[PDB]
Each structure stands twice: as structure tokens, then as C-alpha cells.
Amino acid sequence: RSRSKRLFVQLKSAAMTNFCYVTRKSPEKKNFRIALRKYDPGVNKHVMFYEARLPKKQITLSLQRYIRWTGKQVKLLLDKVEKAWEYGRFQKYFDNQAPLLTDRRGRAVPRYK
Amino acid sequence: RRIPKWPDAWLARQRKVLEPLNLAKLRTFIESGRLDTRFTITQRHLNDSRCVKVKNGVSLFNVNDYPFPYKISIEVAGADQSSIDAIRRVGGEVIIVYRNRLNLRAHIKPYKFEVLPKTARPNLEMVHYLEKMRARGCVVKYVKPQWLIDEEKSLK
Amino acid sequence: ASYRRPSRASPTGQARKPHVGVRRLAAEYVWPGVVLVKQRKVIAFNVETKRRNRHFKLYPGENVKVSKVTNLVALCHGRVKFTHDVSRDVLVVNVLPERREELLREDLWRYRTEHVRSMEENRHICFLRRKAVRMFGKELVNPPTKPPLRPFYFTKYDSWENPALPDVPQLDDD
RNA sequence: UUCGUUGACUGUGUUUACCACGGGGAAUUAGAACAGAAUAUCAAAAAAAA
RNA sequence: UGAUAUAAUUAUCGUACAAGCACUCAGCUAGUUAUUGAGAGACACUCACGAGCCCAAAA
RNA sequence: GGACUCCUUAACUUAAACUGAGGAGUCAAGUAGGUACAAACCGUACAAGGAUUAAUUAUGUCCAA
RNA sequence: UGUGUGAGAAGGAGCUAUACAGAUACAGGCGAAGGAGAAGCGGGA
RNA sequence: AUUAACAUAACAACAU
RNA sequence: UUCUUGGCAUAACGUUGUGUAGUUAAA
RNA sequence: AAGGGAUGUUUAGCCGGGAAGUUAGCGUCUAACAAAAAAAAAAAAAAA
RNA sequence: AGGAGAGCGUCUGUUGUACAUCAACACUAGAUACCGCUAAUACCACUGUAGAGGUAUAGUAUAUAAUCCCUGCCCGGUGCAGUAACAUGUAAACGGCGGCUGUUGACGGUCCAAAGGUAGGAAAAUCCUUGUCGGGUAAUUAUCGUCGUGCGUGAAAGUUGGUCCGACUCUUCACAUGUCGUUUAUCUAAAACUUUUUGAAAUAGAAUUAUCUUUGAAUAUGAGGAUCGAGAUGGCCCGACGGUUAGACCCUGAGCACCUUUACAUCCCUUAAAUCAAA
RNA sequence: AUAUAACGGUCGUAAGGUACGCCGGGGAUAACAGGUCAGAUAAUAUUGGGAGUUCUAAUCCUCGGAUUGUAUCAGCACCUCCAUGUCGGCUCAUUAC
RNA sequence: GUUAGUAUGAUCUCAAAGUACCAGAAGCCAUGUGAUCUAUAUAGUAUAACGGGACAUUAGACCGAACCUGCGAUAGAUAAAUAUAUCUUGGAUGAUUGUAUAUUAGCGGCUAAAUGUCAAUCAAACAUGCGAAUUUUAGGUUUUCCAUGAAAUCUAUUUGGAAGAAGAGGCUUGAAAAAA
RNA sequence: UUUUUUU
RNA sequence: UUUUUUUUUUUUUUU
RNA sequence: UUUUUUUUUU
């Protein structure tokens, strides 16, 4: 494993184009905001990139299988399903990965959602 | 176990691909006389001539943008831009009609049905595809819905 | 008694060896991207008190580039040439841009190891030793016509100038 | 000069150094072409009552 | 009478040789099979048709 | 993931048929000949097959021969 | 046209997974100059 | 009635 | 005919998977 | 969530007979073979 | 299977073993813990039976070993008992109990701890396979007595032991004696030989089966040299790594099979918790 | 966003004994007997030094090297393969100095 | 006057096949039998034997016959016997001996406690199995002739040892027939 | 079927 | 002085 | 019902 003490920062575009960059800095400069002028393909122009102040029970294979088999603690999965549903997804038209929740017989034909 | 996953493979493997048909084979068939150019050629004639076994829809594609010498009015479900341009340059025609799984069977094998079915309405995807091909320049034949007419009356 | 077992003792040993040295001989056709000489940036202590030859690196000559690890790589389609430096007592690799053609026995003299005093002299010699100028050219002696070999991952052993194969023009040479 | 800058950019392509394979990854070219947005440096100033 | 000659089998770097089986004979006994596979720089036969080939189960 | 010998060389008691490296031959998978007696050394125009024939090789020439 | 190559529980005092948003990348530009003497400030652009 | 292993007998031999 | 550039690392980042993130107005 | 009794299964490096100590990615230090390596057989000069 | 000294020690009774050739179990006795009746405990078809057609001088569980003998200190510690709704009491239940330094040394300094081996025995069922001295013998290191340092054991963990007792080790005394230096004579026979009757097994690659020496790291009736004149029966057991099958050690086993503070996973039971009977 | 540092990566923080030892295939009982090796060491002779102190060799102690040999100790391989402290005694024997 | 594929018949078993060249362990699970030998005190439904002596004296007392049992030595160990033969073995009024018919069954029972015993090699009994048994060890593997002709090397496997498995490397390329 | 020993 | 050596399988050393 | 169906074409 790596023993690097360097902090991980996250630069976001000022254009609200959902563009982000990845870099590193020293740990001493904790209270220092990084600002650069990088290329933004979302607008085909040079825009500002500012450092963002980016900040849970993890689900494993074992846990998943247990849940799926026994049926205990299904709310963890149901929350993800609700999130997905809320977000643009499960659309009938213009969708191949997950056009529908399940088939008529109650099956998930798309292996990769 | 070393190379990562590749969903793109098995996602596109389950796609329903239309049956391709090169224009050179059609030209050879016309020269041999298997197909009659005096009338409009259709999938019924194409299947009965043993040219291409039609199962879900014939598609036309050209190679090296070769021009078409003859002039014909073919009826297929889809065609490439090069084929459309080559056929239209001489004065040919490409007609597209909407047919579902049942209707295609009915049309290709009318003898199999005591009472012929009724044409079904298209969905959003098929309507978009038909309108897209109309811009390409294929004569589309299908019933239009009310929501499109209403919207277009104002859009124009 | 006692004995400390070193970390590098058997079976835990270095399997990959530092194959440092020249990789192309004289009168050897090369193209850009091929590594001519491999080197390492690591330097040991007391370099001036050793017998081994690998502790000494070569300097760049003509039509060469230095990589990140101080490797000498070619930059043009040509033959490899070696030269010695009197001022420094160090060999220098030189590349002469040449087209693909039959190598005659009367042109071997062009690729001889000579001694120099200066880089300027190096170039001056290079110029004289060069077959022909790009802008003037010459008459090729039995140039290739067949396409190149297949990719490595396809076939490790490919026939050169296959009669069976058709004739293809050469454009990469120039 | 106590000088500028963020290029530590974004896309198309399957040709190449080494080679059991894997990790082109002790770390190789302008694949010299094509489609966008940035930074740095300009060049020239001959003829003096024979 | 003259000359000449280290039973056989398997393993093994090693005829390895003072290791393992066998008194002899009679009968039995160890690479069987593509309605489903094939030519992949350590080796791949042949017949028919041809941009066309085969036709499954009823019969 | 090899047994003997030739040159170089690590370890050992300049020990041991040990343990382990660099590059040539032989055996392994080689016949018959020489070396007194049991693979490794020398020689071979080196064993498809048959017969009552001639030869410079290691090497020999008092007797067993 | 003459180079690569550390095997054996052999020797040695090998050994540390780390740094940087920049007088640590960095165009252009600049950059250390004997001895003696003064100063007692571990200073090149 | 019947192969081999196995058991017994007869004949055949002289440069000894 | 264009005067430069896709860092720094003589110790270079743990592959794959999970999780997270990202993509689908098409035949 | 705690206790008692049963069932099942695991406990792998390497020198070394065994035990113990030591060690495990990558990188890296220590090397001996000869004379057509000698104008030292075959070369040069000959006023040959 | 006798006389005498001394070590150990409840046998009678059951049985072949927890190491170095020298054991265990059971028991007369005492003591601790649980339990008030549909008792506890056991089998584990659960409104059952045993316990028991019994009732705290009863039933059951654990450990020790004589009728007696005076029988040491310690609850920091797992567990149980109790409840400030986590003081305190149980060592005859549950592992055990120590360093420097100064004057042969009562005594003085200092560290640590819950406590800091008690007494007795003591060259030992324990250290060491020759500790000093005394008794026996022509010699005693074997053995008894004794000293208590050389290492050390250690009290209802069972220590020590008066008297009595002995299929338990050892020392020593007495009678006869072929055990003996060292071997004889007679007889018998489920001993041995001949004949009659009758008739096996282990083994066996083949065979017409050599003495000396030297080759082959194992090894010579079979290989080089020398030498050498055959067979059958009784007898012996020096070789042919003699034959058969008693014992016994190791592994690359990615092989079982048992036991177990592998308590990692699972099951059963007891706490806890829920449900119906139930107005 | 944790592990795989056993870092060609299943570590899943899941350990020991068997003298009650059965089955399978190999030859090793915790000084690794024999053969081979000859470090220590043994035999003969030699040299330096110290005793005998009149005296270097009547005689004795010790050191270096060389030849021969291997009793005993250590080490011990790829070779060999019976059962033990790698024998104690009894009977009966052969060879060399 | 420029595409070359598709489907049969042979051979073979190369990561195919509810068998995969053949033979060959310990052992697990399921369903049954066994208390006629042996252990538990023969548990009253039944039940037998013990001659004598010492002024031992109602007792774990002593000698001793029957009865139970069998120390040591010898022989046998292919047996007169798969635990026998001789002699002064020990107990013998008591946890004495002996008997008809009965109970406890293996994921077990018995056990005055040895891993001793349950139908003469039980740290987990015996019988049957279309539950048709597994092996990096190891044995065997059957007619001839001809052509060609190896390795004991490398990475990886926490890397082994008596070459296990996977990859790479190693083979048919060339030649070598002649007169002014 | 032995050789050597200057002047 | 030389021919005669590990000829160390035996005889022989005939020079 | 399965497979195949030139990338060349004055």
C-alpha cells in the first residue's frame, strides 16, 4: 500500500457544466483554495476551475446475497431503487441498459443496469 | 480474470439486426431476369426469388458509392444514405411502410391467414425513425397520430 | 552459532536482470521509435573505482534522442553508426538517414568506426559519409516492393518479400 | 527584473521499441495528418564633402 | 580338443545389480464410443454441388 | 530444474563420488576395437543385409599372442 | 562489427514505499570568476 | 472322446 | 513556414472485483 | 444478547533429520578464461 | 513360604500397566455443595418412568484416604453466592506463593507484591547412576545409621509417625546342595536309528553349482590372473544381505481416524423475549 | 471507499498433540553405523629450543615441515540399508607387529 | 472475362461425454441382524454345593481336601492344545462359587476405570447397497517392417521433488553430380 | 648391429 | 653413458 | 430451420 500523506482535492468548473479535475497538494496548505484556468469542453472555452469542499455502511457481495436470500434489511436496496427511479432512468423509450424495471413475468433481463 | 468487463459486447449482441442486401446482387438478379423492373419490387418478390431470406426486414447498402445503372422503385424497411443517393440520382424510388411482427408475416405469407389482420399504430421510436427517413428522402407510408398534427399546425 | 539470512536469498531472488547495453550493431537499418541503446538513471557509489563496463554511459551523436531513463533512440529511417571521441574517451552513436535498398559490399566503408575531436567534426564526417541528399536522391539498388511484416501479436515469424503477395508502393521511406 | 503562464488541455486513428502471457508499465517517434481552445518569441532599419 | 561370450523385464544420471514379480503349462484378461466435435505456424484423409449448400419431426 | 571428464572459478580442512556457475566432447539414446576385470577415456571412411579380400590407428614387435 | 550476463542459506554495514500548486513545473532573461587584504553574517541569478 | 505341462517305454548312434 | 509546452519522481501510483462516478432524441 | 454440551472444518513457505533464529514487492554493489592482446611462425627491407 | 537390621506402606477384594522394569482401581472414615414433594438428579415420545410408593439422621454430585495427630499465609484472579438494583463472604471448591547489598552474621539499607515455604521429612518413586564419618567382609562406591550443605520437595493438596501388621525393595546369618573349577556310571522314553504300514508343508527364473587374489562406493559358485582329480548317506551351521511373518521409525500425501480453552461456523439445551388459550 | 505488505493478489486474523496408529509409496531411529574423506590425531626419521648443566644426539619434554598409516574425536554428502545404550558376557577361533 | 462456401463418409480422443486404458486402500452415510460367547452382583418367575484339624472361639482368623483359578521353570510354538503338559500357585463362612428362563444395540450399551469388553486383532462391531468409490504415490499394458527424431532449460505457482499442472523454447532448412 | 671422451 | 617402462595380469631380464 | 453472401467493378 501507498504511504503518501498528500491530500486529495477536487476542482470544479465555474460554468456549471459538471466538469471536474483531479490533482494533489501538500498537507500543510490545508486552508488554501486552488483556482486555475483550464479548458472546458462543455462550452469550448477557457473557464475558471475552483477547489470544491468535497466531504456510511458499505454493501458487499455477502450482504447482498444474504439480503436477497433471506429478505432481511431490504430497505438498503429499496433506497437505491428509489434514488434511481427519482433520477432519470427506467424510461420506456431511448433506453437499452434498463428500459423497464422487470418483464411481464417478473424478471430482470438486463444484466448490466 | 485480468482484463476488466466489457458490457458493450453482450449489450449489442442481443440487438435485432436487419438483414443486409448489397446492390450488386440486386443488379445481377435484375440482369438475369429473376426480378421484374416494370413494377415495384417488394419483400414478397425478394423472398419468393430466393435472393435473401427475409425474417425481420431487408436493408440496402452500397459499396464505394458505386452508382446504380438501372431505375427501380423498391420497397424496403431501411436503406443506407449511399444507396438512397445512388438510387435517387438515376430517378429510382425507395418506399418504406410500417409493419409489426404479425403484419410482416401476413404480408409475406398471405396464404397462411384465413382472415387478414389490420395494420397497427406505431410507437414513439418508430414514428421518430419514419420521420427521420422522410428527411433522408424515402417515401414513408403510415398513419399519422393527432398529437403530431396538432403540434405541427402551430410549429409551422 | 548464528547466521542472518539475507532477504535476497533463494528462492526470493531477482528474476529480471538489468540488460543494459547496445541493442543495434553497425550497418543496421532502423526507424524512428526504436531504442538504440538502453541505460539506467541509477548510479552506484564509487564509480571511479570499478572494473565493469556497464557503469559508463554513451553520449548522443546525430539523429538521436534521449528518453526519460537516458535511453538513446533513433529519429530517422537509417543505419546505425558508431564513433569514438578523443576529447572524452567515450563512444557516440550516429544515424545516417538512408532509404531501403540492397546493401552492397563496396559500401561497407561508410559505416566504419572513426575517431573525432569535436561534435562539429562528427557532423562533418557524417555529411561526407551520407549516401545522398533528400532533395536530390539517387538510383535505388533493388528497392523493396512487397508490404511489411505482420504485427507481432498476429504472427511472430513472417516471411520477408513474399513473391505471392502483390506489389505495394513505398511511402514511409521518404 | 523583484518579469509571463497553468499545457498537470479537450477529441478522431489500431502503425511501431522489448516480448511465454499479463502491466506498450524502469517508462520508445512529430503514428510528421485532421477537428477546437490557451500561453511564449516577432521581423526590418543599407548608403555620412572622392 | 582350439577360440569366444555377464538370463530376461521396469524404473533410474547410472550395463544402475545381490532392489521388485515369476516352478511349469492350459483357459480368461487392460485405448470402448461422435444422429452431439474438429484443423488453430509440432505436423490432419477424401466425395458431391456451387454463390450457393442441408433439411428437422410426422411420412 | 543431469551423471563423468577438459579450462576458469565460488564454498570446504587449497580435503570428499559432495554444493553450486561460465563453454566443448561422450554417455544418456553407441555395436564391434584398445585400456587386465562393469556406461563416461583414445580411435572410427562408426552396426540395411550376405561371403575364406586389400588398407597406417589407438598402438605393438622375447613367451603366453 | 565486439558487446549482454551475480548461480550456490557465498561476502558486504545496500535499503526509507517518502517530496512538490512551484525562489521544486516553468517561455524569455540572468547566473558563481585566483591569491592577499577588510568584515565575523554557514547566501550565485 | 479330448491340446499343452507332466509320467513311462521301444528303436536309432562308433574317428573311438 | 511555425523560435516554447501534455510536468516532477536514482522507490511509480496494488491488477481484477465490490461500492461510487459516468453514457444511450437509435437500425 | 450470554452460558453448557455436541457436529463440521482449518492450521500451506525454505537450508536443515527436526526445532529455533532469519527472510518474502521493486531496485542495486563485489568476476576469473589470451599472444595473428608482441612487426616474438606467416611481417618489413632487399644493395632482388 | 526360615532368624535379625532398616526404607516404604490398609489390606481382604478386581485387573496385566499414565516413562527410566519395580502399577493402578475399589474401601472401613472424615469433610464440602444442591434440594421442602409434582423435591434435586437421570432417560430425553414428555400431564411418562427411575429416584420412591422414600421425606433434611432422606436423596444426589465432586475430591481426599486409618480407628487419633495440634491441620500453616494469601480473595490482586476465572466462576459461583450476594446487590450500592456489580460493598461483601467462600483456599477440606476452583493456578499457587521472590531480588540486590553490608556486618558464621540475632541486626541495618533499598525494590516489588494479594501473600511473599510454616513445620516436618530430607543423597529421596524426587538431585546425582561413587557427598563426610561409623557398623559387616581378605576388598563394599551396593545397603543401614547419622550430619542438614549440593541440588531441592512440601501439610485433609495429605506431611510426619509410636505400637501392630506383610506375596514390597534391599543388606546380612544357618542346613543341605553337580550352580560350579569339571566333568562321570546305570536305567527309562510322546528322545534317536533300522524294518513293516502309510505318506505332508515352507521353497523353487533357469542350471552341469570352486580355492586364492583383485576389480564393481551396495556385492562374487558366474568378471581378469593363478591354481585345482568327480558322487551318495549321517553330522555341524561359517557364507549365499538364507526362508516366513513378530515388532518398529519417517513422509510432498493437496489422505482417513480419535482427543482437545482451533470457541471460527452450525445445531441442541438453559437465560432473555414474544404469542394463544383468555370475558 | 476498506483488505490482499504471504504484495502473480481466496486470508475469509480459523490452533496443537497422538508412545492407541491403520492405508499408500520411499530406505533416514535424536553421535548420520560401514565404505570414501584425513581437520585433529598415530608410526619413523629430521630441525629449533628447554632438561641431564661438565655435556646438543646414554636418556627425557616440546615445535615446524615431509613420507606412510587411520586406531580414536569432530564433520558427514547422491553412495550403501539392519532395527539397541549404534554392545555387555559365554562357547569356539584365524592373522600381523 | 476476378467472392468460395456448405454438407457427407473415414481416422483419432487433443481441457467433450450421469463410465472414459485396466486392476487396486484406509474410510463415510443409509437400511437391517446379533446379549446362545462376553460385561452388568441371575434383578426370587426358579435355584444347588462346601469332607476334616488347631482349648482358633459367634471373626475379611490359620493348615487343608472337593470347587474356582493357574506364580515360576521346562517342553511345545507346522503343537498331543490356534492359552495345553508337571510341580508345594492363590482363594476356600465370603465384593464364596454354580444354574433354567430374561434386560441394556453402534450418533450405542456395559465398565470396583484397562481404550478392558459386546460372536476368537472394535480409539468406534457385523450383513446388504444400480448410495453402481477417491487416489499428483504405485503395478500392468499384447504383431512386424520402415521414415524422422528430444529434454533434464526459462517465467509464474508463499517452489517443492522421484520433470505435477499452464505458457514459452526445441523439428523436414538446405542442398552435395560437368568437357575447350 | 651399442655410443662418447676438442686441440 | 645408453638401449629396459607402473613390464604393477603371469614367465623372463636371455644386453 | 441453420450457415454463407466480393469492399474489387470501363
Q: What are phi and psi of B27, to 5 degrees?
A: -65, -45
Could A96 and B123 be called an inter-chain contact, meaning their C-beta atoms sit closer than 8 Å?
no
Gaps after residue numbers in chain B (C–N over 2.5 angstroms): none
Answer whether A106's CB lies under 8 Å from A90's CB: no
Q: What angle do CA B76, B77, B83 make, to 5 degrees?
A: 60
Three-state secondary-structure class, residue B98: coil
DSSP state of B156: -
B10/A contact by beta carbon, under 8 A: yes
Q: Return the biggest CA–CA distance within chain B.
A: 60
Residues of B in contact with A96 (CB under 8 A): 11
Nucleotide with C1' nearest the C20 CA: G4
Resolution (angstroms) equals 2.9
Q: What is the b/e burial string over B7-32, where b = at least 16 CB atoms within 10 angstroms of the residue's CB?
A: eeeeeeeeeeeeeebebeebbebbee
What distance lies between CA A38 and its chain's CA centroid?
23
Q: Cell 494533489 identifies what position? A: A24
Question: Which residues pair with residue C73 across a beta bridge?
Answer: C35, C65
Residues written for chain C: 174
Q: Of A91, A103, A112, which to mutate for an interface test with B (greatest number of B Cβ within 10 Å)?
A: A112
Answer whether C117's CB lies under 8 Å from C109's CB: no
Three-state secondary-structure class, residue C59: strand
Residues of A in contact with B7 (CB under 8 A): 112
The H or E element spanning position B21 is strand B19-22
Q: What are phi and psi of A8, to 5 degrees?
A: -105, 120
> CB < 7 Å to strand P — which of 12-51 in chain B?
19-20, 22, 24-25, 28
Question: For residue B55, which of B121, B101, B14 has the smallest C-alpha distance?
Answer: B101
Closest chain A residue by Cα to residue B7: A112
Q: What is the 3-state secondary structure (H, E, C) of chain A?
A: CCCCCCEEEEEEECCCCCCEEEEEECCCCCCCCCEEEEEECCCCEEEEEEECCCCCCCCCHHHHHHHHHHCCCCHHHHHHHHHHHHCCCCCCCCCCCCCCCCCCCCCCCCCCC
In this structure, the strands spanning A35-40 and A45-51 are antiparallel
Query: C20: exposed, middle or buried (C-beta count within 10 Å: 0-12, 13-18, 19+)?
Result: middle
Could A93 and B10 be called an inter-chain contact, meaning their C-beta atoms sit closer than 8 Å?
no
Decide: CB of A3 under 7 A of nucleic strand L.
yes
Residues of B in contact with A112 (CB under 8 A): 7, 10-11
Report the C-alpha gap between A96 and B125 in whole angstroms.
13
Cα end-to-end span (Å), chain C: 72
Report the C-alpha gap between A32 and C22 in whole angstroms.
50
Nucleotide with C1' nearest the C154 CA: E41
C-alpha cell at C174: 521518404
Cα end-to-end span (Å), chain B: 57
Radius of gyration, alpha carbons of chain C: 21
Q: What is the b/e burial string over C82-119, where b = at least 16 CB atoms within 10 angstroms of the residue's CB?
A: bbebeeeeebbbbbbbbbebeeeeeeeeebeeeebeee
Gaps after residue numbers in chain C (C–N over 2.5 angstroms): none
Decide: CB of B148 under 7 A of nucleic strand P.
no
